[PDB]
Design a protein around this ligand. Structure first.
Ligand SMILES: Nc1ncnc2c1ncn2[C@@H]1O[C@H](COP(=O)(O)OP(=O)(O)O)[C@@H](O)[C@H]1O
Length: 298
C-alpha cells in the first residue's frame, strides 16, 4: 500500500498525461465543478488505478472502486450509481468488459443524471481504449493514453521504492533493474523487492550490480527483462509456427492461455521492444527475437 503515489507530484513519468490531467483537475477544483469523465488506457501496471485514486483525492471526494466483470446485472450498477455523492469518482477498471445491460444504465447516467443520480465523475480504465464501444468511448471528455515508461523514469521509481523499503542502492544497480522492468512500474517495483530479498540473505550493505544479477538469475529474467512466459511466447512462434504469421487465437490455444492475456498483457512490450510484429495474417517474430534467443536466423 505504501509505494503508491498519492498525488501527481509523486507520480514519476507520464509527463504528457500529468499535464493534461492537471489542467482539467485544477480548473474543476478552482471552479468547484464536477470533473469531466476521464478514460485511462494502457498496458497493466502503468498506474491507471493510481491516477484514478489521485483524481478523487485531488478533487477531495470519495472514490468508488469496481470493474466491468463484477457488474453483472443492472441491479449492481443501480446500487452503485445511487450511492454516489456529488463530485464522487466512479472508477471502473476493465470498463470495456461491461455487458450491454449495465452499459446502457451507465450511459444514461452521463447523457443525463437519473435512471436521480448525483453529478459524478466517471473514470474508466482499460488496457486498450479501442476496446470500448463507439458510444461509451465518445462519452469521455478526457482520454489519457499511457505508454511504457523510459528506463530513466523506471530507475527513478526504483530508487524511490528502495528508499521507502529502507534499502540503499547504487545507480548502476537501479539502472540494471530499470532495463529489465519491461517498461512497467509494477514490474520494476516487484523486481526491487526481490533484489532486496537477495541483499538480505547475502548480508550486503547496499544493492549493487552483483546482487541484481544474482536475483535476475534466480527469477529467470534475461538481459532484456523477458521472463519465462515471454520467452515461451517467442519460442512457440519460432518452433511451432516457423516464425509466424500465426493468428492470435491459434497462438493462445497452443500456449493454453486466454487470447486477452496474450494481446493485452504480454504482447504490448514484446511489440514495443521489437521482438514481435503484427501483420494481417497474424503475429510474427523478428530477427531480434531469433538472435536474442540464440536461434539460427532462417
Ligand atoms: N508513475 C508511477 N510512479 C511510481 N509508482 C507507480 C507509477 N505508476 C504505477 N506505479 C506503481 O505500480 C503499481 C501498479 O500500478 P497501478 O496503478 O495499479 O496499475 P494499472 O491500474 O495500470 O494496472 C502501483 O503499485 C504503483 O504504486
Amino acid at each position: 500500500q505504501f509505494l503508491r503515489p498519492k498525488s501527481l507530484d509523486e507520480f514519476i513519468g507520464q509527463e504528457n498525461v500529468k499535464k493534461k490531467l492537471s489542467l482539467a483537475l485544477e480548473a474543476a477544483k478552482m471552479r468547484g465543478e464536477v470533473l469531466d469523465h476521464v478514460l485511462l488506457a494502457g498496458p497493466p501496471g502503468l498506474g491507471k488505478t493510481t491516477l484514478a485514486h489521485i483524481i478523487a483525492s485531488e478533487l477531495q471526494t470519495n472514490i468508488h472502486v469496481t470493474s466491468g466483470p463484477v457488474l453483472v446485472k443492472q441491479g449492481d450498477m443501480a446500487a452503485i450509481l445511487t450511492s454516489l455523492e456529488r463530485g464522487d469518482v466512479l472508477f471502473i477498471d476493465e470498463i470495456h468488459r461491461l455487458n450491454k445491460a449495465v452499459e446502457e444504465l451507465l450511459y444514461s447516467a452521463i447523457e443525463d443524471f437519473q435512471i436521480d443520480i448525483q453529478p459524478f465523475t466517471l473514470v474508466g480504465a482499460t488496457t486498450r481504449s479501442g476496446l470500448l464501444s463507439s458510444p461509451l468511448r465518445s462519452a469521455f471528455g478526457i482520454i489519457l493514453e499511457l505508454d511504457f515508461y523510459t528506463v530513466k523514469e523506471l530507475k527513478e521509481i526504483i530508487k524511490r521504492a528502495a528508499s521507502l523499503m529502507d534499502v540503499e542502492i547504487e545507480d548502476a544497480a537501479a539502472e540494471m533493474i530499470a532495463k529489465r522492468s519491461r517498461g512497467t512500474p509494477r514490474i520494476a517495483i516487484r523486481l526491487t523487492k526481490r533484489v532486496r530479498d537477495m541483499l538480505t540473505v547475502v548480508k550486503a550493505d547496499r544493492i549493487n550490480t552483483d546482487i541484481v544479477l544474482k536475483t535476475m538469475e534466480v527469477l529467470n529474467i534475461d538481459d532484456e527483462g523477458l521472463d519465462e512466459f515471454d520467452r515461451k511466447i517467442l519460442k512457440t512462434i519460432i518452433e511451432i509456427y516457423r516464425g509466424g504469421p500465426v493468428g492470435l487465437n491459434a497462438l493462445a490455444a497452443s500456449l493454453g492461455v486466454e487470447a486477452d492475456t496474450l494481446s493485452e498483457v504480454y504482447e504490448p512490450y514484446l511489440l514495443q521492444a521489437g521482438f514481435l510484429a503484427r501483420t494481417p495474417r497474424g503475429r510474427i517474430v523478428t530477427e531480434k527475437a531469433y538472435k536474442h534467443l540464440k536461434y539460427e536466423v532462417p
